[PDB]
Design a protein around this ligand. Structure first.
Ligand code: A1AQF
Ligand code: CL
Ligand code: CL
Ligand code: CL
Length: 163
């Protein structure tokens, strides 16, 4: 565990993270994909060996000794709002289990289903709250990665509001 477990946000590529493990915003088939998933494929291609896993689940594969937690958020193009919400919450609960099992003191996490799986909606608050719901009972330092300047401000605001 971290001595004083925290949440932070950074605006940069999660493939350059300074944490003990990474969460991939994976597809269910373990394909290289786009966005975060492709950056993760380029950095930790070895972690894509048998990484395929269903929607709402997380599967960890080592790259050397570095854990890559493949978390499959729903594609809101395919799911109803209600079912997509349920699966997005579930993916994050599975990430919390894996982070706990691995015994890491820090984890780099993107906001699941906020990019090409968002169904063209802004899901910052929805995705972040499900992240908090899952990770609040863990003692790892959580570092959230984003790419948009306005999202960095809103995530930072949401973290500070609860401190
Ligand atoms: N990043 C991202 C989204 C989820 C996996 S993907 O690369 O297929 C699209
Ligand atoms: Cl960067
Ligand atoms: Cl996405
Ligand atoms: Cl972003």
């Amino acid at each position: 565990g971290a001595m004083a477990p925290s949440y932070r946000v950074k605006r940069m590529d999660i493939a350059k993270n300074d944490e003990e493990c990474v969460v991939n915003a994976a597809n269910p088939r373990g394909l290289p994909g786009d966005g975060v998933c492709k950056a993760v494929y380029k950095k930790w291609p070895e972690s894509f060996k048998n990484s395929a896993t269903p929607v709402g689940t997380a599967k960890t594969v080592m790259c050397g000794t570095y854990p890559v937690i493949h978390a499959v958020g729903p594609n809101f193009s395919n799911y109803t709002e209600s079912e997509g919400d349920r699966e997005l919450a579930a993916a994050y609960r599975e990430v919390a289990k894996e982070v706990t099992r691995l015994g890491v003191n820090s984890v780099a996490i993107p906001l699941l289903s906020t990019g090409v799986y968002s169904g063209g909606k802004d899901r910052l608050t929805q995705s972040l709250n499900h992240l908090f719901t899952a990770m609040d009972s863990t003692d790892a330092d959580v570092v959230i990665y984003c790419r948009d300047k306005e999202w960095e401000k809103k995530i930072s605001e949401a973290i500070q509001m609860r401190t």
